[PDB]
C-alpha cells in the first residue's frame, strides 16, 4: 500500500516564545514556535514578518549575540537532536533565513533524562550548555570557526537533575542547578573550563532545599545569583545571602513558567498551572553607586489568563501568553485594579485547536461538503471548534431590506460607483452612497414603478434601464430620458441582458437586438425561436474592443443551450442538456485567458463548456452540482482577474491555474449580487438575500474558518445524530471535596448552565464529574446535561439505530472507577433517546468491567469490555440481549469496523482482526501483528490496509496478504505530531487519490491521508528525491532524516508514504528551479521528456483535496 500525507491545518499550540533583536538590532522581535513552525513577529503598540518550516520538532529555542555580530542570532534544537544557529538576512524584498552552523548532537549511547532536553546559553556567549542524557552535560564551544557545532561531553556526579541555568555576574562560565538524591533535593554550582574541559567547584551550595524545587531563574546583574521556585517557597540564592519567602497566595497551585520584564531583573512574571498570573518583585537598596543589595521579594496576583505554557513581556505593558491548552492571548496589564478585581485585560485572542481529544465529520449545511467539529482544549479552556472550508466575507454594512430581486451598481457622474439600484417585485428603487451612509435618492429618467431587469452605465456618457415593459435610455449630462424602446404590440419583456453597447431583450419566444447610440436605440433583428427563452448573455468575452459577436441562449421544452451569431442569429452550436428542468441563468466569461461558457439549471446543476469564439463551438463539457435551489451566474473582479459568483442556497465562487475551483462561500444564502466599488466601500461586493443587503470585501483564496464554542470544561467524546439536528458530547468538570457531602463546583461551565439538567443519583481534594451534553447543531446552546453516577467514568459514545428500531439512540459506555481497585470491576452501557426536548433513559446494562469503546456493527451494537469483545442485539422489548462473545489477550481499547471486519487494538500496538461468521454466531481471528510499542489511535483504510499512530509521533500501515494471518509492516512515516483520533471524510465538494482520512493532534494539527496508485507513488517518490536537492532546508536538516521512522531504540527510513507538504512546495519555488527539478523526467500519458507545467497540473490536482 502507498499513501499520501498532507497537512491541512498547521499546528496551533505554542511550544515556546522568546523576545530579542533578530530581524534588525533596531527592531524588537517576538519569536513563537508552534511545534514544527516558527513565527517571527515585530512588536508595535504584533506585525507578521516571516514564518518558516523546520524539518524537526522544535525543542530548544533561544536568542543570543556572539562577540562581534550586528544583531541577535537564533539557536534551534530539534527532538531528533538537530542543532543549528540561524541568522536573519534581507536583500531588499527577499526575506531569507540562512543557516550558519548545523549538526546532530545525538550521542551513540545514553538514556534521555526525565526532565527532557534542557538548552542554555551562557551570558558571555562563549558556550552552549545542553543536558540531553542523564549523568552527562554536552557543551558546544561558540568559536567563530565551529560551523559544524562540534561538541564534547562533561561527566556529572549528580544523576537526577531538575533544572539548570547559566549564572549571570561570573567571570567564568558558571551553571547553577537543582538535583535530587535519596537524601533529598539540593542546589549546587559549577564552573566550566572551556579549555581544560571539566568542572571546578562553584561559588556556593545549600543542601536540603524545598521538597518541590522545580524552577531555576538566573537573575542578571546587578543582583546576580538565582531564584528557586517550588510548590511552597520562593527562595533567593547569591553567595552566603539567603532570602526566602513563602506567600500563601501561590500555595493553591503550581508555578510552571516565568519571564523577565525589565532587563535589570527587579520585576519577574510567574505563570500558574490553572491560568493565574503573578508578578514577582525584588526590593533593592543602592547603598553607594555600584553595589546593589537585595532587600526583599514580593509577589502579587494580577488576574486570570489562558493556561499558560510560555510567557514574554513585550513593551509598553503588553504581554504575550502562549498556551497549549487554550487560545493564545495578547494581554495588557494596567497599574489600576479593574472593577471586577485584578489588573489584567485581554486584547487579542489567537485561535488554538490543541489539544484535540476527538472529532467527527458532519454535513452541517444540509448536503454537499463536510464540516469538522472537534473537542478542543482542556480544563476552563475547553471548547468545541467548527471548521469549514470556504471563502470568507468581511461584512462592512448590513441593512434589513426584504424583497430585493435585483442589484446593479451605477456611476452617476463621470470613475467609481456611487449609486446602487434595487429591483423589487414589480417596482424599483435607487440608493445613493455618500461615504458609508446609504440614503434613498431618485434618478431622473429612470422609471420607479416597474420591475427593473437590468441597469448600468453604457457608451456615450449614458445610462440604461430595462423594465418589464420598456428599454429606457437616460443621459448623464442633464440626466433625463432620451430614447425609450417598447414592444411593437406593447407586450411585456421576458428576459433581457446588456453589455455596454449592445442590448438583446426577448419577449416570449421572440428576441430583439438593439444597439446603444447617442440619444437612440437602433433596433436591428427580431428572429423567432422555437420555444420560450430562459436566459441570455452578451458578455464581450475577450479581444473585442467593446461589443461581442455572440449570443448565448437557453430555451424551454427543448432545454437546449444555444450559441447564436450577431446579428444573424445563426445557430452556431446547439447542445441538449438534461431535459426535466429549464435553464435559469447563463453566462460567458474567461478564466486565465481560457474561454468557458457557463450555464446553470433551475435544479442547481451547473454546466461549463469550452468556447471557440470564432467557431462558436462549445466542447469538452463538464457538469457539477452546487445546490438544490436555482442558480444565478454573475461576473466580478478580484485580484486583477475575473471570477464568477454563483448565487444560490449554497453560494459558490468560481475562479481559475487552468483548473476550475468551485469554492464554497462562508455565508447562509445569497440570491442576488453585484460588484460595488464606491468611495466608502471600495472594490467590495453587494449581497442580497430574502431580508438583508450585505456589503463587504472578499478574500482571495479559500482558507479554513474556525468557530469557537466555549464550554469552560474538558470535552472528551463527540458524535452527530442527524435526525435530531444535535451533537452528543461527553464532558468532565472539576469540583472540590467540600464540607458535608462535598462536591461544589469551581466555576459556571457548560454542564452547570444547561437548559434542562438531569442526574443519575441524588445525595443519598479534586473530584471529576462526567456529563453527557446535548448541543444544538445550529445555535450551539447546551440543550441538556446528563450527569452520570458518582465514581462513574464515561468512556465511549455512539449514536446509531439498532435492530429494526427506527428510533436513533445515544449509547454511552461507562466504567466505575474507585481508587482502591486498580482494574475497574464493573461498568455500564446506557441507551439514551433524545425525543423533542427530553433525554429519556431507554435501557441500561450493568457490565462487569470497563467499556473502552463501542461501534455500530451491522444493526447490532458491538462493545468492548476489558479484554472481551461482546456483541449485543436490540430486542423488540427495547433491551440489549447478548448474541456473541469473544475473549482476547489484548485490552480491546480501539475498535473500528468496515463491513464484516473488526479491528481491535490496545495501548501496546498489538492489533487483531476479527470477522463475523453469521452461520456460527461467533468470531474468528483473521490476522494479528504484535510489535510492542505505544499506540494512540488506529483506523481502517480499506479491507486490507490499516493505519495507526505509534510512539515518537509516527504513522504505520499494516497489510493482510496457513500463515496468511501475518500483518506486514508496509508503511512508516515520522509525522512529528501526536495523532489522537482518525475519522473518514473530507472538507471539499464531492481521480488520483483514493479514499480520505482526517486526523487530529495534541498540537492541534489537522492532517489528511489518502491512497495512491503505484504509478503515482513511484513518480512522486522520484519527485521527493528531486526536491530535496533543491529546496533550502532550515538548519540543513536532511528531509530523509526528518521523516525517518523514529523511536528511542530504532530509526528506519520512511516508506509507503509521501510528504505532501514537500510535493505541494513545488508550486512555491521559482520557475527555473522547477525546470531544475524536472532534470530529464519520463512522464507518462499513454513517455517523453517532462516539462515544468507537466508537474504543475499534477500537483494542483493534489492541492484540491484539503
Amino acid at each position: 500500500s502507498y499513501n499520501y500525507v498532507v497537512t491541512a491545518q498547521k499546528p496551533t499550540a505554542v511550544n515556546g516564545c522568546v523576545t530579542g533583536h533578530f530581524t534588525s538590532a533596531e527592531d524588537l522581535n517576538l519569536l513563537i514556535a508552534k511545534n514544527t513552525r516558527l513565527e517571527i513577529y515585530v512588536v508595535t503598540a504584533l506585525r507578521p514578518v516571516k514564518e518558516v518550516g523546520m524539518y524537526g520538532k522544535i525543542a530548544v529555542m533561544e536568542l543570543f549575540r556572539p562577540k562581534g555580530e550586528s544583531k541577535d542570532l537564533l539557536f534551534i534544537l530539534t527532538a531528533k537532536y538537530n542543532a543549528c544557529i540561524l541568522e536573519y538576512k534581507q536583500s531588499g524584498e527577499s526575506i531569507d533565513i540562512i543557516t550558519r552552523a548545523h549538526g546532530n548532537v545525538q550521542d551513540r549511547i545514553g538514556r534521555p533524562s526525565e526532565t527532557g532536553i534542557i538548552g542554555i546559553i551562557d551570558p558571555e556567549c562563549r558556550m552552549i550548555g545542553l543536558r540531553l542524557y542523564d549523568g552527562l552535560f554536552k557543551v558546544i564551544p561558540l568559536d567563530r570557526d565551529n560551523k559544524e557545532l562540534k561538541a564534547f561531553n562533561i561527566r556529572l556526579e549528580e544523576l537526577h537533575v531538575i533544572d539548570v541555568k547559566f549564572l549571570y555576574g561570573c567571570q567564568a562560565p558558571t551553571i547553577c542547578f537543582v538535583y535530587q538524591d535519596p537524601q533529598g533535593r539540593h542546589v549546587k554550582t559549577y564552573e566550566v573550563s572551556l579549555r581544560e574541559k571539566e568542572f571546578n567547584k562553584g561559588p556556593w551550595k545549600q543542601e536540603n532545599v524545598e521538597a518541590e524545587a522545580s524552577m531555576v531563574i538566573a537573575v542578571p546583574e546587578p543582583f546576580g545569583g538565582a531564584i528557586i521556585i517550588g510548590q511552597e517557597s520562593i527562595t533567593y540564592h547569591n553567595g552566603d545571602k539567603y532570602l526566602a519567602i513563602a506567600p500563601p497566595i501561590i500555595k493553591q497551585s503550581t508555578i510552571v513558567c516565568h519571564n523577565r520584564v525589565d532587563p535589570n531583573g527587579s520585576r519577574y512574571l510567574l505563570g500558574d498551572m490553572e491560568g493565574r498570573l503573578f508578578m514577582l518583585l525584588l526590593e533593592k537598596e543602592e547603598q553607594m553607586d555600584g553595589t546593589v543589595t537585595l532587600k526583599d521579594l514580593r509577589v502579587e496576583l494580577l488576574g486570570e489568563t489562558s493556561i499558560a505554557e510560555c510567557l514574554t513581556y513585550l513593551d509598553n505593558g503588553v504581554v504575550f501568553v502562549g498556551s497549549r491548552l487554550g487560545d493564545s492571548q495578547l494581554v495588557k496589564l494596567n497599574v489600576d485594579s479593574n472593577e471586577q478585581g485584578s489588573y489584567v485585560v485581554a486584547m487579542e485572542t489567537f485561535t488554538n485547536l490543541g489539544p484535540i481529544v476527538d472529532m467527527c465529520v458532519v454535513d452541517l449545511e444540509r448536503q454537499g461538503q463536510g464540516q469538522l467539529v472537534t473537542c478542543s482544549g482542556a480544563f476552563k479552556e475547553g471548547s468545541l471548534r467548527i471548521i469549514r472550508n470556504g471563502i470568507g466575507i468581511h461584512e462592512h454594512a448590513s441593512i434589513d431590506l426584504p424583497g430585493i430581486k435585483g442589484l446593479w451598481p451605477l456611476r452617476s457622474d463621470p470613475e467609481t460607483d456611487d449609486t446602487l439600484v434595487l429591483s423589487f417585485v414589480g417596482q424599483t428603487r435607487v440608493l445613493m452612497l455618500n461615504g458609508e451612509e446609504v440614503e434613498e435618492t431618485e434618478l431622473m429618467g429612470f422609471v420607479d414603478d416597474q420591475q427593473t431587469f437590468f441597469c448600468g452605465n453604457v457608451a456615450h456618457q449614458q445610462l440604461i434601464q430595462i423594465t418589464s415593459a420598456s428599454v429606457r435610455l437616460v443621459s448623464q449630462e442633464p440626466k433625463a430620458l432620451v430614447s425609450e424602446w417598447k414592444e411593437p404590440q406593447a407586450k411585456n419583456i421576458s428576459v433581457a441582458s446588456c453589455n455596454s453597447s449592445q442590448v438583446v431583450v426577448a419577449v416570449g419566444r421572440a428576441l430583439y437586438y438593439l444597439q446603444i447610440h447617442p440619444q437612440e436605440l437602433r433596433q436591428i433583428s427580431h428572429t423567432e425561436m422555437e420555444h420560450e427563452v430562459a436566459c441570455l448573455d452578451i458578455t464581450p468575452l475577450g479581444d473585442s474592443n467593446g461589443l461581442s459577436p455572440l449570443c448565448a441562449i437557453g430555451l424551454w421544452t427543448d432545454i437546449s443551450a444555444r450559441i447564436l451569431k450577431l446579428p444573424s442569429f445563426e445557430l452556431l452550436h446547439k447542445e441538449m442538456l438534461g431535459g426535466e428542468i429549464i435553464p435559469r441563468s447563463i453566462l460567458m466569461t474567461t478564466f486565465e485567458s481560457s474561454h468557458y461558457l457557463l450555464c446553470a439549471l433551475g435544479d442547481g446543476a451547473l454546466f461549463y463548456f469550452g468556447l471557440n469564439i470564432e467557431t462558436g463551438l462549445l466542447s469538452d463539457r463538464k457538469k457539477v452540482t452546487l445546490g438544490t435551489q436555482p442558480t444565478v451566474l454573475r461576473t466580478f473582479r478580484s485580484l486583477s482577474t475575473t471570477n464568477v459568483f454563483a448565487c444560490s442556497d449554497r453560494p459558490t465562487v468560481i475562479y481559475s491555474n487552468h483548473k476550475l475551483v468551485f469554492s464554497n462561500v462562508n455565508l447562509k444564502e445569497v440570491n442576488y449580487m453585484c460588484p460595488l466599488n464606491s468611495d466608502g466601500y471600495p472594490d467590495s461586493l453587494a449581497l442580497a438575500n430574502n431580508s438583508t443587503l450585505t456589503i463587504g470585501t472578499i478574500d482571495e483564496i479559500q482558507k479554513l474558518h474556525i468557530r469557537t464554542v466555549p464550554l469552560y470544561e474538558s470535552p472528551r467524546k463527540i458524535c452527530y445524530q442527524e435526525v435530531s439536528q444535535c451533537f452528543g458530547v461527553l464532558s468532565s468538570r472539576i469540583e472540590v471535596q467540600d464540607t458535608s457531602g462535598g462536591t461544589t463546583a469551581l466555576r459556571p461551565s457548560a454542564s452547570t448552565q444547561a437548559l434542562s439538567s438531569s442526574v443519575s443519583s441524588s445525595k443519598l481534594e479534586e473530584v471529576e464529574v462526567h456529563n453527557l451534553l446535548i448541543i444544538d447543531q445550529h445555535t450551539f446552546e447546551v440543550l441538556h446535561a446528563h450527569q452520570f453516577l458518582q465514581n462513574e467514568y464515561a468512556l465511549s459514545l455512539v449514536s446509531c439505530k439498532l435492530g429494526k428500531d427506527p428510533n436513533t439512540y445515544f449509547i454511552v459506555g461507562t466504567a466505575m472507577v474507585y481508587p482502591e481497585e486498580a482494574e475497574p470491576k464493573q461498568g455500564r452501557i446506557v441507551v439514551f433517546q433524545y425525543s423533542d426536548g427530553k433525554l429519556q433513559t431507554v435501557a441500561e446494562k450493568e457490565v462487569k468491567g470497563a467499556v473502552y469503546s463501542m461501534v455500530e456493527f451491522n444493526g447490532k451494537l458491538l462493545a468492548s469490555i476489558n479484554s472481551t469483545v461482546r456483541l449485543y442485539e436490540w430486542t423488540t422489548e427495547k433491551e440489549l440481549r447478548t448474541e456473541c462473545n469473544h475473549y482476547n489477550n489484548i485490552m480491546a481499547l480501539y475498535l473500528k469496523t468496515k463491513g464484516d471486519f473488526i479491528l481491535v487494538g490496545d495501548l501496546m500496538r498489538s492489533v487483531l482482526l476479527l470477522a463475523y461468521k453469521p452461520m456460527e454466531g461467533n468470531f474468528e481471528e483473521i490476522a494479528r501483528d504484535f510489535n510492542p510499542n505505544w499506540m494512540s489511535a488506529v483506523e481502517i483504510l480499506d479491507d486490507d490496509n490499516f493505519l495507526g499512530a505509534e510512539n515518537a509521533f509516527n504513522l504505520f500501515v499494516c497489510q493482510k496478504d496457513e500463515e496468511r494471518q501475518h500483518l506486514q509492516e508496509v508503511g512508516l512515516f515520522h509525522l512529528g505530531e501526536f495523532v489522537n483520533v482518525f475519522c473518514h471524510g473530507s472538507l471539499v465538494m464531492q481521480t488520483p487519490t483514493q479514499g480520505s482520512v482526517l486526523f487530529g493532534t495534541v498540537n492541534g494539527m489537522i492532517g489528511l491521508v489518502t491512497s495512491l496508485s503505484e504509478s503515482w507513488y513511484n513518480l512522486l517518490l522520484d519527485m521527493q528525491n528531486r526536491l530535496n536537492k533543491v529546496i533550502k532546508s532550515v538548519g540543513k536538516i536532511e528531509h530523509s532524516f526528518w521523516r525517518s521512522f523514529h523511536t528511542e531504540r530504532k530509526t528506519e527510513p520512511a516508506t509507503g508514504f509521501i510528504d505532501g507538504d514537500l510535493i505541494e512546495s513545488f508550486l512555491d519555488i521559482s520557475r527555473p528551479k522547477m525546470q531544475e527539478v524536472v532534470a530529464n523526467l519520463q512522464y507518462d500519458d499513454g513517455k517523453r521528456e517532462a516539462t515544468a507545467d507537466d508537474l504543475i497540473k499534477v500537483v494542483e490536482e493534489l492541492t484540491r483535496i484539503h
Partner: protein
C-alpha cells in the same frame, strides 16, 4: 508462622560438597548470531534468571560440559513449542555458575548449576556425529519502552515528573498516578488506564500477591528492574508449557507483567493433567518455601528435572510406601511418592518433617508437568 529458612532450597545442598564456582559473566550482543550447543536430554523451557541444576551421566554429555567449563560455559536450552514438533524456533541460554565432576561409584558423573541468561531465536540446527547439537541462534533483544507520557508530556511540566521517595501508602499511590499521568488529559484515555501499563504500578500489584505467599522483604529479594522482576515471577508461576512459551515469546516486560497478573487471578485451581477432571490443590494453598518462590526446578538422582510447586494441602492423592530422607531437596523433610487416586499418575511427593520442632510438619510437593491450571466457572494469556 514458619521457621524453615527459605534460603536452603535455592542452594541445592542435596548435590553434595561445595562445587567450584565461577564469578565471570558472559553476555552476547543483541541481534548477534551465535552457535551454542544443546544438551540432548534436557526437556525444559528455561526462563532467564531461573536456576537449572543438572546431573550428567552419559560420556558425550560429560565431555561436552568439560569443554564448556573451559570456554564461555553457556549452552542452549531449546524451547519445544509442540510435542511432535521436530524443529525448535526459540530457546534460552544457560550459564554454568557451579560445577563438579566426580568419580565416586566408578562412573564419571557431572553435577552442574546453570542460570538462564538471554533469550534467542533458533535459526539453524546441526546435529554432529556425537549426538550433541549446535544451534545457530539470534539473541532476542529486550525491548524497553519509555514512559507512556514521554511523547505526550508538556515541557513546562517536565520538572514535575520527579517525585521524592515513598515511605515504606494507599494515599501515596493516588498522588503518584495523578502526578506521573497528569498529561493524560491530552490523549484519548484517562490516567487510570495508563496506570494499567505502568511497570511500577504493575510490579506493586504483583508484590501484593507474592506477599500473600511469603514474608519476604520487598526491599531486597525481589529485583527492582522490571525486566528482571517480570522474569522472576514467570519462573514461579505454576503454568503449563504452552503458556510458559507464550510468556517467553513476550518481549516487553509491560506485556509480560499484565499477562502474569491475569494468570495469577484467573487460574485458581490445579487439576491432574492426565485426568483433567480431578482437583489436586488450589491457589489458596500455594506458598513459597524457597527464595525463588513457590516453584523451582530440582534434580533427582538420575538427572530428571522437576519444577516442584510447594502447597500446604492436596486431595485425591494416594501415598505409596513409607517416607525417605534420601536425596531430599528440602533438607530436614522426608518425601513419600504421591500418585493420583484416579489415574495413578505420579503427581509429586508429600514432605513430612523429621524433627518435631519443624513447621510446617507436612506439605506437598507437586511436579508442574503433572498439573493443569483450570479457570473456575484452555486458558488464554491476557
Amino acid at each position: 508462622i514458619i521457621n524453615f529458612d527459605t534460603s536452603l532450597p535455592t542452594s541445592h545442598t542435596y548435590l553434595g560438597a561445595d562445587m567450584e564456582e565461577f564469578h565471570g559473566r558472559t553476555l552476547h550482543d543483541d541481534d548477534s548470531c551465535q552457535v551454542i550447543p544443546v544438551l540432548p536430554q534436557v526437556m525444559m523451557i528455561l526462563i532467564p534468571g531461573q536456576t537449572l541444576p543438572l546431573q550428567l551421566f552419559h560420556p558425550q554429555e560429560v565431555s561436552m560440559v568439560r569443554n564448556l567449563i573451559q570456554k564461555d560455559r553457556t549452552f542452549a536450552v531449546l524451547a519445544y513449542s509442540n510435542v511432535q514438533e521436530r524443529e525448535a524456533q526459540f530457546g534460552t541460554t544457560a550459564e554454568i555458575y557451579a560445577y563438579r565432576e566426580e568419580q565416586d561409584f566408578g562412573i564419571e558423573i557431572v553435577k552442574v548449576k546453570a542460570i538462564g541468561r538471554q533469550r534467542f531465536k533458533v535459526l539453524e540446527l546441526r546435529t554432529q556425529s556425537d549426538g550433541i547439537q549446535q544451534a545457530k541462534v539470534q539473541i532476542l533483544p529486550e525491548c524497553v519502552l519509555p514512559s507512556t507520557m514521554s511523547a505526550v508530556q508538556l515541557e513546562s511540566l517536565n520538572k514535575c515528573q520527579i517525585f521524592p521517595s515513598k515511605p515504606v501508602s494507599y494515599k501515596w499511590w493516588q498522588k503518584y498516578q495523578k502526578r506521573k499521568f497528569h498529561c493524560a488529559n491530552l490523549t484519548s484515555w484517562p490516567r487510570w488506564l495508563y496506570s494499567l501499563y505502568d511497570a511500577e504500578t504493575l510490579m506493586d500489584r504483583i508484590k501484593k500477591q507474592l506477599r500473600e505467599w511469603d514474608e519476604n522483604l520487598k526491599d531486597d529479594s525481589l529485583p527492582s528492574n522490571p525486566i528482571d522482576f517480570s522474569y522472576r515471577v514467570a519462573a514461579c508461576l505454576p503454568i503449563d508449557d504452552v503458556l510458559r512459551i507464550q510468556l517467553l515469546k513476550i518481549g516487553s516486560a509491560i506485556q509480560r507483567l499484565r499477562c502474569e497478573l491475569d494468570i495469577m487471578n484467573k487460574c485458581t485451581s490445579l487439576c491432574c493433567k492426565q485426568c483433567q477432571e480431578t482437583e489436586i490443590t488450589t491457589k489458596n494453598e500455594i506458598f513459597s518455601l524457597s527464595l525463588c518462590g513457590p516453584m523451582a526446578a530440582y534434580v533427582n538422582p538420575h538427572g530428571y528435572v522437576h519444577e516442584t510447586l510447594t502447597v500446604y494441602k492436596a486431595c485425591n492423592l494416594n501415598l505409596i510406601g513409607r517416607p525417605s530422607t534420601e536425596h531430599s531437596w528440602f533438607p530436614g523433610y522426608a518425601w513419600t511418592v504421591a500418585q493420583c487416586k484416579i489415574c495413578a499418575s505420579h503427581i509429586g511427593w508429600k514432605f513430612t518433617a523429621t524433627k518435631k520442632d519443624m513447621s510446617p510438619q507436612k506439605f506437598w510437593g507437586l511436579t508442574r508437568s503433572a498439573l493443569l491450571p483450570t479457570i473456575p466457572d484452555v486458558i488464554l494469556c491476557l
